């Protein structure tokens, strides 16, 4: 069980760790988060008490280094940094741990939510979507635009999600216009899965990462990407069976975890109604259709 | 964006452009079977493509053999339309190619956009005007060539005849659209109006009676008169 020590909490902030969150008061004696489960990526995120504008956070994996959070008063944000002195890290963590200045990652033992939301998410892929190679962790915030958004403006601060565009030469074979537009199986299986992602696990990993950035930061471009990746599968007549069953599980847990009060902005009516009720896969997502109908029947 | 009454003059500027109407591409008669069920029998169709500045009409004739063995024909018809329009554009040099294509039905937007991906500089636009190009098959020589076709065929006729020798495109489009609009509301009356005088001859080589200027004014008045009445006759006003 790993630890993210905090140098201090000089400004009042709501701190999130994965799906959990807690309120820290200005100058409260808060010095980090302990008992973080090894084996998964994690996200630690921030919403300042004074500026609900800009949720921001850091994706990280404690197996890849020792990470701490220090408020930077010039840039006005909680930065994550790596401790390169392993002796300093053990000493600082033990110190704070003995004084009981840390919150415990508060996971219920029965509870597989975080695993289910991050099953296919790997740090190495996150770092190719979020390009900042000198750090082992990745910063994301509410306002970052996607590479696809920039084509329709700072490239260094972009989310480099795989571009999906249903009316594009990549998606449409010459001579198969109608066939490829109404059945996107070619685009899914040959162009995206075989050509770009290599396998369905990398596809699902980007889909899950896009959802999490939409949910935790309200990142609009991430929400677009999540929906595009769902729609591409649902609009394909030919999808591997294991992929459909896994997607049903993936979406089920995403819909289960979404705040009930954010469904008006995070869920696209057209996509979901098409996917659940009109598309080729309208009968393949039983668990997702059941939870959507009982939780958000208004959307449908 | 969409084309409406506010940008009703853009049609006659110097950007080479064509309209596309697909309403007569997939045509059927509906009939009873021996068992009492209903079946359809396709008849030949056409895509009504119109250069509204010059009046050139490419009546690409859709022979019923294109539907043989196909499903979801009403959907296919829209993609067949887009395929044929794209093929038309490709046969021309770049300078001769148009700058915009306006579809009369919004359902043509996605099929045409997808077929025209190779042509990123050609704008595909819908319109809000209620345009009467479905009544093109009420023009006798156009209906005749469509119904006689035994194979796919291109029948390109300038629908303005030599009207551009005496009037502007704006007025020519107004005459053509009122002529077509009348035929759609009451084909019999409209046709009576156009031929009631035996001495005025649809010349063999033109699709319209050789009217003088004065006679066109009368004809136009009679056509606006028909549309008015039918409106009342329909709504009882
Ligand atoms: C309690 O001392 C400090 O917090 C010093 C700042 N700092 C914090 C955490 C860490 O791992 N390394 C480090 O240098
Ligand atoms: C795309 O072409 C058009 O829309 C009409 C072009 N045009 C002009 C003059 C003429 O005599 N013939 C002809 O075909
Ligand atoms: C009086 O005639 C005119 O003003 C021509 C314009 N017009 C006519 C018929 C029609 O269906 N759509 C259209 O735009």
């Amino acid at each position: 069980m790993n630890t993210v020590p905090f140098t201090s909490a000089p400004i009042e902030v709501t701190i999130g760790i994965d799906q959990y969150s807690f309120n820290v008061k200005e100058n409260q004696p808060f010095h980090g988060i302990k008992d973080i489960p090894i084996g998964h990526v994690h996200v630690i995120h921030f919403q300042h008490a004074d500026n609900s504008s800009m949720r921001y956070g850091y994706w990280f994996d404690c197996r890849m280094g020792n990470f701490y959070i220090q408020y930077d008063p010039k840039d006005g944000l909680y930065k994550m940094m790596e401790e390169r002195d392993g002796a300093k890290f053990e000493n600082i963590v033990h110190n704070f741990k003995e004084r009981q200045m840390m919150v415990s990652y508060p996971k219920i033992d029965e509870d597989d939510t975080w695993y289910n939301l991050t099953e296919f998410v790997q740090m190495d892929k996150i770092r190719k979507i979020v390009r900042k190679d000198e750090n082992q962790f990745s910063y994301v915030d509410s306002s970052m635009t996607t590479v696809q958004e920039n084509e329709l403006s700072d490239p260094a601060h972009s989310l480099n999600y795989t571009v999906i565009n249903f009316k594009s030469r990549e998606a449409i074979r010459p001579g198969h216009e109608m066939e490829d537009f109404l059945d996107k199986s070619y685009y899914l299986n040959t162009v995206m899965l075989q050509g770009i992602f290599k396998n369905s696990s990398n596809y699902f990993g980007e889909l899950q990462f896009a959802f999490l950035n939409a949910m935790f930061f309200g990142n609009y471009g991430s929400s677009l990407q999540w929906h595009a990746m769902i729609e591409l599968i649902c609009s394909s007549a030919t999808v591997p069976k294991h992929m459909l069953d896994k997607l049903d599980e993936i979406l089920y847990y995403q819909i289960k975890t979404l705040p009930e009060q954010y469904s008006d902005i995070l869920l696209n009516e057209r996509v979901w109604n098409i996917c659940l009720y009109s598309s080729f896969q309208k009968n393949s997502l039983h668990n997702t259709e059941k939870i959507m109908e009982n939780k958000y029947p208004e959307l449908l | 964006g969409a084309m409406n009454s506010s940008n009703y003059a853009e049609l006659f500027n110097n950007d080479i452009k064509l309209f596309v109407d697909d309403t007569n591409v997939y045509r059927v008669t509906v009939h009873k079977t021996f068992e009492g069920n209903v079946a359809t029998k396709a008849i030949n169709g056409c895509i009504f493509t119109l250069n509204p500045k010059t009046g050139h009409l490419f009546l690409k004739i859709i022979h019923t053999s294109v539907w043989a063995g196909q499903k979801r024909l009403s959907q296919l018809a829209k993609w067949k339309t887009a395929e044929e329009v794209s093929a038309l554009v490709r046969s021309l040099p770049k300078e001769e190619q148009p700058k915009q294509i306006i579809v009369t039905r919004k359902a043509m937007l996605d099929p045409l956009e997808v077929h025209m991906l190779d042509f990123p500089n050609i704008a595909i636009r819908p319109t809000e005007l209620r345009l009467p190009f479905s009544a093109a098959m009420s023009i006798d020589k156009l209906s005749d060539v469509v119904m006689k076709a035994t194979e796919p065929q291109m029948v390109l006729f300038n629908i303005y005849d030599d009207w551009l020798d005496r009037i502007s495109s704006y007025t020519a489009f107004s005459r053509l659209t009122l002529l077509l609009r009348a035929l759609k509301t009451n084909e019999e009356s409209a046709k009576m109006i156009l031929l009631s005088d035996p001495t005025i001859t649809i010349k063999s080589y033109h699709l319209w009676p050789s009217f003088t200027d004065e006679q066109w004014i009368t004809i136009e008045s009679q056509m606006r008169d028909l549309i008015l009445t039918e409106y009342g006759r329909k709504y009882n006003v």
Side-chain angles (χ1 to χ4, degrees), chain A residues 1-151 154-300, chain B:
Chain A
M1 306 288 270
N2 270 125
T3 306
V4 176
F6 272 60
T7 292
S8 58
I11 69 164
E12 197 156 302
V13 60
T14 303
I15 298 177
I17 173 76
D18 299 348
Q19 75 268 38
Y20 310 108
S21 62
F22 49 92
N23 302 306
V24 178
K25 292 298 169 289
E26 184 188 291
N27 285 322
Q28 184 184 320
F30 175 86
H31 292 283
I33 308 175
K34 62 171 188 168
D35 301 328
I36 302 169
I38 308 161
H40 318 289
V41 309
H42 296 285
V43 53
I44 185 168
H45 40 117
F46 299 94
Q47 191 152 219
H48 297 181
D50 63 8
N51 181 65
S52 43
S53 310
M54 196 180 80
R55 286 177 268 170
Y56 61 98
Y58 303 91
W59 288 96
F60 67 98
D61 183 337
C62 290
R63 294 174 289 186
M64 303 173 58
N66 288 329
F67 304 124
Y68 66 100
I69 299 286
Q70 189 156 137
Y71 186 66
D72 163 14
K74 176 161 166 71
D75 287 348
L77 78 190
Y78 285 112
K79 291 201 181 177
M80 165 173 295
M81 264 161 299
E82 180 181 342
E83 184 47 78
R84 83 153 288 115
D85 182 352
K88 204 215 274 227
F89 188 66
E90 298 187 32
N91 192 226
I92 286 162
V93 166
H94 175 276
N95 185 79
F96 284 148
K97 269 189 157 178
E98 273 293 270
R99 305 226 289 165
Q100 292 197 45
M101 313 253 107
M102 305 198 176
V103 293
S104 172
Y105 184 98
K107 179 189 167 303
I108 305 315
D109 317 278
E110 156 191 74
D111 180 22
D112 271 349
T113 298
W114 191 245
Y115 169 77
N116 293 337
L117 291 167
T118 63
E119 182 176 357
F120 301 94
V121 183
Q122 314 165 296
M123 267 308 310
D124 75 301
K125 296 321 202 305
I126 286 178
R127 299 186 63 233
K128 298 171 196 299
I129 300 176
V130 189
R131 314 198 156 290
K132 194 166 206 284
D133 292 348
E134 66 272 8
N135 302 328
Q136 297 288 303
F137 48 85
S138 298
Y139 169 95
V140 182
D141 67 33
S142 301
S143 75
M144 280 168 51
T145 56
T146 69
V147 164
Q148 176 173 54
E149 285 183 304
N150 300 334
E151 299 159 355
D154 184 9
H157 217 60
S158 299
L159 294 172
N160 300 269
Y161 292 121
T162 302
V163 175
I164 300 171
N165 176 357
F166 297 139
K167 298 195 282 192
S168 72
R169 177 51 68 218
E170 293 69 32
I172 303 296
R173 282 173 298 176
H176 302 257
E177 287 79 8
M178 183 184 192
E179 176 190 13
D180 281 350
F181 184 75
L182 296 174
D183 178 2
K184 318 207 176 274
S185 293
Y186 157 75
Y187 191 34
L188 175 69
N189 290 306
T190 300
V191 174
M192 290 284 161
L193 285 178
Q194 167 173 308
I196 295 178
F197 289 94
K198 305 310 177 182
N199 57 64
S200 57
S201 302
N202 291 341
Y203 190 97
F204 287 141
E206 184 167 327
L207 189 158
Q208 294 182 305
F209 181 61
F211 170 79
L212 292 168
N213 284 329
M215 181 174 56
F216 287 124
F217 308 108
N219 186 272
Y220 178 79
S222 295
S223 181
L224 290 181
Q225 183 68 15
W226 177 53
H227 282 94
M229 297 186 78
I230 299 169
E231 186 172 357
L232 175 54
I233 289 169
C234 293
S235 308
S236 293
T238 306
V239 177
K241 310 87 171 64
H242 75 272
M243 260 194 63
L244 297 171
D245 289 332
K246 182 58 66 167
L247 177 64
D248 192 27
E249 289 305 311
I250 286 168
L251 299 180
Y252 172 82
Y253 283 105
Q254 289 170 344
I255 298 307
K256 186 178 186 72
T257 307
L258 271 184
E260 306 72 39
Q261 304 291 310
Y262 284 45
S263 45
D264 48 316
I265 54 185
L266 288 164
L267 293 174
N268 185 283
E269 193 192 36
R270 178 192 67 82
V271 173
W272 283 98
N273 282 267
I274 272 63
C275 289
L276 293 177
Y277 301 118
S278 316
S279 75
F280 291 108
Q281 306 303 343
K282 59 191 177 300
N283 297 313
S284 309
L285 307 169
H286 301 96
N287 294 348
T288 295
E289 179 176 303
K290 189 175 294 300
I291 190 183
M292 279 290 284
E293 291 187 354
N294 282 277
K295 197 186 179 191
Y296 302 119
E298 326 86 31
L299 195 79
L300 318 171
Chain B
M3 204 267 297
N4 61 28
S5 301
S6 311
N7 56 0
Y8 187 92
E10 190 180 17
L11 297 173
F12 317 109
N13 72 14
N14 294 83
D15 287 339
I16 288 155
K17 49 167 76 54
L18 340 156
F19 274 100
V20 173
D21 186 90
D22 70 312
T23 59
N24 284 306
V25 166
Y26 173 48
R27 296 202 295 159
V28 308
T29 53
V30 179
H31 57 88
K32 283 292 199 63
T33 69
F34 185 86
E35 292 83 13
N37 306 132
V38 176
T40 60
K41 172 182 163 307
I43 61 176
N44 288 346
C46 54
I47 313 122
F48 166 100
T49 303
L50 168 61
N51 182 323
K53 177 99 170 248
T54 71
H56 278 292
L57 162 55
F58 308 66
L59 202 58
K60 168 81 191 208
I61 302 183
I62 303 298
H63 188 260
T64 60
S65 68
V66 305
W67 310 128
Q70 309 295 319
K71 280 76 172 83
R72 296 196 49 100
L73 296 181
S74 69
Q75 177 184 261
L76 177 64
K78 306 179 194 312
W79 293 87
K80 174 60 171 186
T81 299
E83 191 185 13
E84 289 292 344
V85 172
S86 170
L88 168 27
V89 172
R90 293 167 202 276
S91 72
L92 304 170
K94 170 202 244 164
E95 98 189 333
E96 285 190 31
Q97 282 179 357
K99 282 89 184 188
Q100 301 177 10
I101 304 172
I102 313 171
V103 296
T104 57
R105 307 202 290 174
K106 295 194 211 81
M108 278 304 305
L109 287 176
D110 277 353
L112 191 56
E113 168 159 21
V114 171
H115 268 281
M116 301 283 291
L117 291 176
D118 283 347
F119 290 96
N121 293 319
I122 297 183
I124 303 309
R125 301 175 51 190
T127 183
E128 303 282 339
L129 298 155
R130 30 233 225 250
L131 278 178
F133 310 132
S134 65
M137 291 297 94
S138 292
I139 299 171
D140 287 327
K141 259 65 139 8
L142 296 188
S143 174
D144 279 358
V145 70
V146 171
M147 289 316 292
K148 291 190 210 301
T150 60
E151 40 187 306
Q153 182 180 4
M154 162 86 88
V155 164
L156 53 88
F157 267 135
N158 175 328
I159 216 171
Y160 296 159
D161 289 339
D162 60 0
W163 293 353
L164 307 202
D165 303 341
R166 304 187 60 80
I167 64 181
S168 67
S169 298
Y170 180 107
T171 299
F173 192 90
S174 257
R175 189 181 282 165
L176 168 62
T177 46
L178 174 80
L179 278 181
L180 285 191
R181 171 48 79 175
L183 289 155
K184 184 171 180 173
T185 317
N186 188 327
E187 184 177 34
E188 187 215 330
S189 300
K191 289 200 178 192
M192 278 295 298
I193 287 168
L194 282 161
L195 321 178
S196 62
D197 189 342
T199 61
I200 318 176
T201 67
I202 317 177
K203 300 265 178 284
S204 73
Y205 53 71
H206 280 155
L207 338 179
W208 293 114
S210 262
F211 290 115
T212 58
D213 295 359
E214 303 300 77
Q215 289 176 350
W216 269 124
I217 302 294
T218 303
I219 290 303
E220 289 167 352
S221 160
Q222 281 161 9
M223 299 297 221
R224 285 189 202 96
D225 257 1
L226 184 164
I227 299 163
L228 159 56
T229 304
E230 280 306 330
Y231 179 95
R233 284 171 89 255
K234 189 214 265 190
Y235 299 101
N236 301 316
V237 164

